[PDB]
């Protein structure tokens, strides 16, 4: 379950949330998770 | 004396003005062209705004003139209607909001060009003023947001005097004794209710068998209709109009029949409101000489980035497919411009809410039971009547309910339908939940302020999830 | 003499909700109430009756004042039939009390009428008026005895000229002048009600802001400013030294600066005393069971709402936490669930607060002050209702939405709304916080146009992206 914006961020950088891990309330892939992948990739 | 820019937007309505502003805020040298005297388009000048204002004022007039205020100890001499003053409040709000967009343009340095826009080259648009004045704009991108117009009814000529479109209906000069409305969709029901409250004998005639337009949940539509009829608003569903005639005394004879033929009858009225629908406006935009062909409905085909065939020319809002709603046009205008700057562009239309601003209000988002059944999706139903909600009962405004549709096994919220007090605002909590792929459980968990109408939404979700609510 | 699995003492928001969920989870349940009706404070002399008067007085003001005239709704004269207005309120209360009743019948939750006293770790005894008594043996005991009005030292409330919120809600006539002691939520709502109905009202508050605890300061000051414009007067940073009944039935209230000096006297016809409320645990048997209340008179509980005796739980107004009806209900639910073997959480930073005046005020999460105090770095997003389409079309533009988000994670820390629709709008915020939403998340949620909620969307946007579209 991607959070809106997390979904927006992942699309903008062509990333698949599977690559990361959801760190948000009740199994949500938050805007922080999305950014941790854009970072922990373009790192 | 040409001028240039990165993005030129044709149309200053919900989609257009919001796109122009966002474009500028993204750095794009932006221009917005508008042929009418004011910005804001349909919604602002003859749509959402004026209609919500008259809906608000007529609702209050009804509360004071009827038994509501008396039931609360507010006793009055004689409640009189000053229609012109009621029209003035509406006009003042509209004028303030139009002035606001002009100011928001200057603030974000969006260049406002007055005139009729016409694409005269893949990277050029020519605005022509009424006086003949011309202005050329060479642009990298062109954004089409020309919106919509009233769909005429074959054989009946709207003149905005006794035969009106929604525009003429928003400005009548006196309460008509009797009014007939062709079409019981959102716009028709709203305007019909406005005049019914003010004293008109109102009847809406509709081809289909339900009111509220496309997508409305059937149970919701039927309950809504029952309430409106109890208010005095009449309906002739599964009925076709075969023609209308102006009479010797200024009245109008509208001839009708059952949709399937037969049961012919005539109903006479002082004002005939025609609102069977609205359609994409693209008149002399120059789309032909550019090879941009419309679909059968007259819309401009576009991809997920809102690009037309010619990749540097986009289209959004009422002029393209999807719900013809203001917020829909705004979202598209926003993601389109963000898209021009490399941003994502995926927009889930299943999360666009619909609202009918009558009283009771109706609002919904997601899918109706009919759609779930059509897609063969197995589901659970959660219902909670406002008559069981504290704030609603305290306010003595208890019509309707909140109906939640959940995926039979994943308890995921599939649809939220609201008929009653505050439906309009409440549907946004619903929208946000869908955008998060919420489950009935998720919502049921959230602590909602007591007493609030939203508790009906929370509890309907609990009844779906757990199978029982607390207060019902 | 009967028995059950769970016995709840008190049928208010926390009590009756807890009782119903219990039977709904298979627990044989009994609920005991001393009053003639169920519902507790909120339903009988609290939330409900006050919202009814706020609603009615607001409509009275729109019709009696300039609002309706500006809309073409003309009336030669508009007058108040207070009895009738009071009747609408009580008709509402009575309907809702019968409702709780019916809900107990429906969920087979047994109702015992009497003052309940915990006579043993697994026994509760209730005593009626006539003198009779009912013995209740239970494995579990849930105490949701709630609260009572906090009295003011030196001034005795008689519910005549000197009333508490209970008396203020049933006044028999509009007082020519009224003094309110305490400018918190309850005081501001009740004083606004009477100010609209025609009373010359003044609230005296020891603290320097109206609204109670936790309310954002900027929100509190804008709110105050609007109420004063309405004619509601305030005496902040002021102490009430005493009050005296006068020859003509009026009341002289003597006041002076909080820090000292500038003594004055204000005469009124009715004195509303509402400096606070406190947990009610009188003659419950706790002093014998070894249950030691904390200083403020509250029952100390743990995460599972357990007391000293693990089979005895306390929820709602009797325990710490915001003394709100929904807070009481949430606790009563998670407690019962935990009892049936379930986890129990409740982030009190997600329990909203609403002020039902007009403009309304509502918020959830943290205020600017709490953030500064906590050392949390943040950013601010504000959107005035004056720029919100629906607000403007309705010609009801007071206020704004203010969003607070972390300077770096863009996470939503708190939301404060002052203006139309705040009360319902805060619940969209509560949902957003429960998902750890960021400002961008909300800004990217499609909101219907035109709705007041667009103000919330645009505020989250100005905070997330730096600027909104319409302002
Ligand atoms: C009576 C009524 C009530 C409504 N109520 C609601 C409601 O409550 N909620 C809701 O969501 N929707 C409502 N709608 C629909 C809503 O108004 C439209 O969905 C919305 O305006 C679509 O926005 P748009 O920007 O695409 O187009 P529009 O706002 O229709 O038009 C944008 C602008 O394009 C301009 N334009 C067109 N061609 C040219 C050209 N060649 N050169 C220059 N300018 C041009 C037009 O003059 C116009 O100002 C209502 C509509 C009506 C008629
Ligand atoms: C004027 C006013 C307005 C308010 N407005 C709001 C508002 O808008 N929003 C909001 O959230 N909160 C509001 N509140 C507060 C709200 O009413 C309380 O937070 C809520 O009632 C707490 O619920 P409770 O169940 O814990 O306790 P209560 O409802 O206070 O009490 C529960 C019950 O316990 C019973 N009881 C106690 N001891 C015994 C015993 N020994 N035997 C039998 N029965 C017993 C009492 O008689 C009572 O009925 C308002 C309060 C007042 C006074």
Contacts of B305 (CB under 8 A, 6+ apart): B314, B336, B339, B345
> Both C63 and C128 in a single domain?
yes
- Spatial distance between the Cα atoms of B401 and B217, rounded to a whole number of angstroms: 13
Structure tokens at B209: 């068998």
Ligand 2, residue C10: give the atom nearest the CA.
34
CA C61 to chain centre: 23
Distance set, CA B16 to CA A29, B41, B143, C234, C408 (Å): 33, 9, 8, 47, 32
- Tell me if residue C145 falls in helix, strand or coil: coil
Whether the ω angle into residue C450 lies within 30 degrees of 0, i.e. cis, is yes
Q: Which of C331, C347, C363 is the last residue of a domain?
A: C347
> Both C168 and C261 in a single domain?
yes
Number of structural domains (chain A) is 1
* Chain C interface includes A32 (CB < 8 A): yes
Ligand 2, residue B450: give the atom nearest the CA.
11
Does C34 carry a binding-site annotation? yes
Closest CA to C24 of B405, B438, B379, B472: B472
Closest CA to B354 of B389, B322, B397: B322
C185 lines ligand 2 (CB under 6 A): no
C405 lines ligand 2 (CB under 6 A): no
- Spatial distance between the Cα atoms of C30 and C77, rounded to a whole number of angstroms: 53
* Chain A interface includes C360 (CB < 8 A): no
- Spatial distance between the Cα atoms of C379 and A10, rounded to a whole number of angstroms: 24
Helices B14-25, B326-340: crossing angle, 10 deg rounding: 30
Q: Which of C290, C323, C347 is the last residue of a domain?
A: C347
Q: Which of B326, B348, B370 is the last residue of a domain?
A: B348
> Both B252 and B343 in a single domain?
no
Question: Can you give the three-state secondary structure of C272-322, one letter per residue?
Answer: EECCCEEECCCCCCHHHHCCCCCCCCCCCCCCCCECCCCCEEECHHHCCCC
B366 lines ligand 1 (CB under 6 A): no
Q: Do the Cβ atoms of C115 and C126 come closer than 8 Å? A: yes
* CATH, residue A37: 4.10.320.10
Q: Do the Cβ atoms of B440 and B381 come closer than 8 Å? A: no
- Spatial distance between the Cα atoms of B108 and B92, rounded to a whole number of angstroms: 24
Distance set, CA C225 to CA B302, C128, C129 (Å): 51, 49, 49
* CATH, residue C31: 3.50.50.60
Smallest CA–CA distance from C21 into chain B, residue: B470
What residues pair up with C75 in beta bridges, in sequence order?
Answer: B79
- Spatial distance between the Cα atoms of B326 and B50, rounded to a whole number of angstroms: 14
Contacts of C5 (CB under 8 A, 6+ apart): C22, C27, C28, C29, C138, C139, C140
**Residues from chain B contacting residue A8 (CB–CB below 8 Å):** 343-344, 346
Does C51 carry a binding-site annotation? yes
Q: How many residues does chain C have?
A: 471
Q: How far apart are the first and last CA of chain A?
A: 24
Report strand pairing: B134-144 vs B3-10.
parallel
- Spatial distance between the Cα atoms of C181 and C313, rounded to a whole number of angstroms: 34
> Both B16 and B139 in a single domain?
yes
Phi and psi for B62 in degrees, rounded to 5? -60, -40
In sign, the C-alpha dihedral spanning C97, C25, C340, A23 is negative
- Tell me if residue C143 falls in helix, strand or coil: strand
> Both B141 and B13 in a single domain?
yes
> Both C471 and C395 in a single domain?
yes
Closest CA to C143 of C240, C257, C264, C282: C282
Position of tokens 């003139």? B65
- Spatial distance between the Cα atoms of C321 and C423, rounded to a whole number of angstroms: 20
Q: Do the Cβ atoms of B345 and B338 come closer than 8 Å? A: yes
- Spatial distance between the Cα atoms of B444 and C88, rounded to a whole number of angstroms: 31
Q: Name the neighbours of B, counting chains with at least 3 Cβ pairs within 8 A.
A: A, C
Q: Do the Cβ atoms of B9 and B41 come closer than 8 Å? A: no
Contacts of C241 (CB under 8 A, 6+ apart): C254, C255, C256, C263
- Spatial distance between the Cα atoms of C247 and C226, rounded to a whole number of angstroms: 36
Report strand pairing: B271-274 vs B178-182.
parallel
Helices C13-23, C325-339: crossing angle, 10 deg rounding: 30
Q: Do the Cβ atoms of C389 and C447 come closer than 8 Å? A: no
Domain of C192?
150-275
> Both C300 and C310 in a single domain?
yes
- Spatial distance between the Cα atoms of C470 and C388, rounded to a whole number of angstroms: 8
- Spatial distance between the Cα atoms of C191 and B416, rounded to a whole number of angstroms: 38
Smallest CA–CA distance from A31 into chain C, residue: C438
- Catalytic annotation, residues of B: 450
The DSSP element (H or E) to which C324 belongs, if any, is: none
- Tell me if residue C242 falls in helix, strand or coil: strand
Pocket test for ligand 1, best of B8, B10, B12, B13 (most atoms within 8 A of CB): B13
Domain of A1?
1-43
Question: Can you give the three-state secondary structure of chain B, one letter per residue?
Answer: CCEEEEEEEECCCHHHHHHHHHHHHCCCCEEEEECCCCCCHHHHHHCHHHHHHHHHHHHHHHHHHCCHHHHCCEEECCEEECHHHHHHHHHHHHHHHHHHHHHHHHHCCCEEEECECCEEECCEEEEECCCCCEEEEEEEEEEECCCEEECCCCCCCCCCCCEECHHHHCCCCCCCCEEEEECCCHHHHHHHHHHHHCCCEEEEECCCCCCCCCCCCHHHHHHHHHHHHHHCCEEECCEEEEEEEECCCCCEEEEEEECCCCCCEEEEECEEEECCCEEECCCCCCCHHHCCCCCCCCCCCCCCCCECCCCCEEECHHHCCCCCCHHHHHHHHHHHHHHHCCCCCCCCHHHCCEEECCCCEEEEEECCHHHHHHCCCCEEEEEEEHHHCHHHHHHCCCCCEEEEEEECCCCEEEEEEEEECCHHHHHHHHHHHHHCCCEHHHHHHCCCCCCCCHHHHHHHHHHHHCCCCCCC
Q: Give the other-Cβ count within 10 Å of B55's Cβ.
A: 23
Interchain proximity B346–A7, CB inside 8 Å: yes
B44 lines ligand 1 (CB under 6 A): no
Number of structural domains (chain B) is 3
* Chain A interface includes C436 (CB < 8 A): yes
Specified resolution (Å) = 2.2
* CATH, residue C406: 3.30.390.30
Q: How far apart are the first and last CA of chain C?
A: 67
B122 lines ligand 2 (CB under 6 A): no
Task: Name the structure determination technique.
Answer: X-ray
Q: What DSSP assignment string belongs to chain A? A: -BPTTHHHHHHHTT--GGGS---SGGG-B-HHHHHHHHHHHH-
> Both B126 and B102 in a single domain?
yes
Interchain proximity A26–B343, CB inside 8 Å: no
> Both C374 and C316 in a single domain?
no
Q: What DSSP assignment string belongs to C216-232? A: -HHHHHHHHHHHHHHT-
Closest CA to B453 of C16, A29, C427: C427
Structure tokens at B117: 């826009």
> Both B241 and B177 in a single domain?
yes
Structure tokens at C8: 């709840």
- Tell me if residue C365 falls in helix, strand or coil: strand
Structure tokens at C147: 């609260």
Closest CA to C314 of C346, C275, C280: C280
Pocket test for ligand 1, best of B47, B187, B324 (most atoms within 8 A of CB): B47
* Chain B interface includes C283 (CB < 8 A): no
Closest CA to B143 of B316, B305, B330, B283: B316
- The residue among A2, A3, A12, A16 with the most chain B CBs within 10 A of its CB, best to mutate, is A12
The CA-CA-CA angle for residues C233, C418, C406, to 5°, reads: 130
Q: What DSSP assignment string belongs to C53-87? A: HHHHHHHHHHHHSSHHHHTTEEES-EEE-HHHHHH
What residues pair up with B439 in beta bridges, in sequence order?
Answer: B412
Q: Do the Cβ atoms of C154 and C244 come closer than 8 Å? A: no
Phi and psi for C238 in degrees, rounded to 5? -140, 140
The DSSP letter of residue C151 is P
Distance set, CA B246 to CA B167, B249, B358 (Å): 20, 8, 30
Long-range contacts of C172-178 (CB under 8 A, 24+ apart): C172/C82, C173/C82, C174/C80, C174/C82, C174/C198, C174/C199, C175/C199, C175/C268, C175/C269, C175/C270, C176/C200, C176/C269, C177/C201, C177/C202, C177/C267, C177/C268, C177/C269, C177/C270, C178/C202, C178/C268, C178/C269, C178/C270, C178/C271, C178/C272
Contacts of C62 (CB under 8 A, 6+ apart): B60, C68
* Chain A interface includes C431 (CB < 8 A): no
In sign, the C-alpha dihedral spanning C356, C361, C365, C368 is negative
> Both B316 and B357 in a single domain?
no
């Amino acid at each position: 379950r991607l959070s809106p914006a997390a979904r927006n961020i992942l699309e903008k950088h062509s990333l698949d949330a599977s690559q990361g891990t959801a760190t948000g309330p009740r199994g949500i892939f938050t805007k922080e998770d999305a950014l941790k992948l854009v970072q922990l990739k373009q790192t | 004396q040409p001028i240039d820019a990165d993005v030129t937007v044709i149309g200053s309505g919900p989609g257009g003005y919001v796109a122009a502003i966002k474009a500028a805020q993204l750095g794009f040298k932006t221009v917005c062209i508008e042929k009418n005297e004011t910005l804001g388009g349909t919604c602002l000048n003859v749509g959402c705004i004026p209609s919500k204002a008259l809906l608000n004022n007529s609702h209050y007039y009804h509360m004071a003139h009827g038994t509501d205020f008396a039931s609360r100890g507010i006793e009055m001499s004689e409640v009189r209607l000053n229609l012109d003053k009621m029209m003035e409040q509406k006009s003042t709000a509209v004028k303030a909001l139009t002035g606001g967009i002009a100011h928001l343009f200057k603030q974000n340095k969006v260049v406002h060009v007055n005139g009729y826009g016409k694409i005269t080259g893949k990277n050029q648009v020519t605005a022509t003023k009424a006086d003949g004045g011309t202005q050329v704009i060479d642009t990298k991108n062109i954004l089409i947001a020309t919106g919509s117009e009233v769909t005429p009814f074959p054989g009946i000529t709207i003149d905005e005097d006794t035969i009106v479109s929604s525009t003429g209906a928003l400005s009548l000069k006196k309460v008509p004794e009797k009014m007939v409305v062709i079409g019981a969709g959102v716009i028709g029901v709203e305007l019909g209710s406005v005049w019914q409250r003010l004293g008109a004998d109102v009847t809406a005639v509709e081809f289909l068998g339900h009111v509220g337009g496309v997508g409305i949940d059937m149970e919701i539509s039927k309950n809504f209709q029952r309430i409106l009829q109890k208010q005095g608003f009449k309906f002739k569903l599964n009925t076709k109009v075969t023609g209308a005639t102006k009479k010797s005394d200024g009245k109008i004879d509208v001839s009708i029949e059952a949709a399937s033929g037969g049961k012919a009858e005539v109903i006479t009225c002082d004002v005939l409101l025609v609102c069977i629908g609205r359609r994409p406006f693209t008149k002399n935009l120059g789309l032909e000489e550019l090879g941009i062909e419309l679909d059968p409905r007259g819309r401009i085909p576009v991809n997920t980035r809102f690009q037309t065939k010619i990749p540097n020319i986009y289209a959004i809002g009422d002029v393209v497919a999807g719900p013809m709603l203001a917020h829909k046009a705004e979202d598209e205008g926003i993601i389109c411009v963000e898209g021009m700057a490399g941003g994502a562009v995926h927009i889930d239309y299943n999360c666009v809410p619909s609202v009918i601003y009558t009283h009771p209000e109706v609002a919904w988002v997601g899918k109706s039971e009919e759609q779930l059944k059509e897609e063969g999706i197995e589901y659970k139903v959660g219902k909670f009547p406002f008559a069981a909600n504290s704030r609603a009962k305290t306010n003595a405004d208890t019509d309707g309910m909140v109906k939640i549709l959940g995926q039979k096994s994943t308890d995921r919220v599939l649809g939220a339908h609201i008929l009653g007090p505050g439906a309009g605002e409440m549907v946004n909590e619903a929208a946000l939940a869908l955008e998060y792929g919420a489950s009935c459980e998720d919502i049921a968990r959230v602590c909602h302020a007591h007493p609030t109408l939203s508790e009906a939404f929370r509890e309907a979700n609990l009844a779906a999830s757990f199978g029982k609510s607390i207060n019902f």
